[PDB]
């Protein structure tokens, strides 16, 4: 009966190392509306901003969790989502090609 | 404005 | 070419926390401008768009009046959780959700196209205001309880009053005061990427970045033949600065990239574009 969230991990602008940008993790299509979403830098949590809860025509919810960041060739970024429709937390690493 | 009248279902 | 003022309510009880939460946000088109969430100290309606930083000038009580309306709304729909939960003889243990969506579609010069007020319980349609705005349709038996209650209380007359007057007038207010943001058509920056899979296969991806509003149509064609069903279409996403991104990909025999063309439709473009990949 629950619906599982779809996840997209991406940057606002095309990424070049050094030149700063914003990291996004868009979580949508899920139900019921309680979740935890996190952006992770090499597994460590980041201080982040979460959008306000809204929903689509099919009533499923969407949220955006975002933060400034600076890409390197040595750092790794992922988004950790947990929902009641998931048996356990899911991580989606950030590949600069989503 | 948010609507000023909500009726409980 | 209409515009919309839409309000999205969410009330939900969750397993590990007594007392349900209430979220109330409002949109003009694809632009959020206000929020309310009861998980705060003294929960207040707050601005979420630049032009609403100015709204206290022309309406000093806007924040107080809208904080009043949302805090009352939070209360009635926390009781509504209990009511509907009882209609379905569900237990206090579970976690349930009531959602509300109401607003109006206005035509070119203050012309109400449609008004609506819809309610879902645990993500399924429960009750909705008919297009005539003088009647409801109920989903199941438990919703008939509500419709009979609301018919008695004549709540459609109060609903149509807001939707016909107040909704329209506030959309026009917001469109004029938020002109720089709301009456804007940002065409996308489009470009195609090339990612090979093997010796014989290739993935061609058609990007579209920084466009507003959200509505867009990406389309891959092969010698003019439509290839939507063989397409991999990402769901459109926000970028964080108030715009949206989207791409469509399709797999093609290598060395034949140039027989395929991407087709972009957006309100902000003078006329649709047909794209092609070039070394």
Automatic annotation (TrEMBL), chain C:
Membrane association type: Single-pass type I membrane protein
Entry GO terms, CC: external side of plasma membrane; extracellular space; lumenal side of endoplasmic reticulum membrane; MHC class I protein complex; phagocytic vesicle membrane
GO BP term, pick one: antigen processing and presentation of endogenous peptide antigen via MHC class Ib
GO molecular function: peptide antigen binding; signaling receptor binding
Limits of the Ig-like domain: 188-276
Protein's UniProt keywords contain Lipid biosynthesis: no
Record-annotated disulphide pairs: 104-167, 206-262
Alphabetical UniProt keywords: Glycoprotein, Immunity, Membrane, MHC I, Signal, Transmembrane, Transmembrane helix
Intracellular or extracellular location(s): Membrane
Main location per the UniProt record: membrane
Signal in keyword set: yes
Function (record text): Involved in the presentation of foreign antigens to the immune system.
Family of the protein in this entry: Belongs to the MHC class I family.
Protein name: MHC class I antigen
Taxonomic lineage of the native organism: Eukaryota, Metazoa, Chordata, Craniata, Vertebrata
Region of the whole protein represented: 25 to 303 of 368
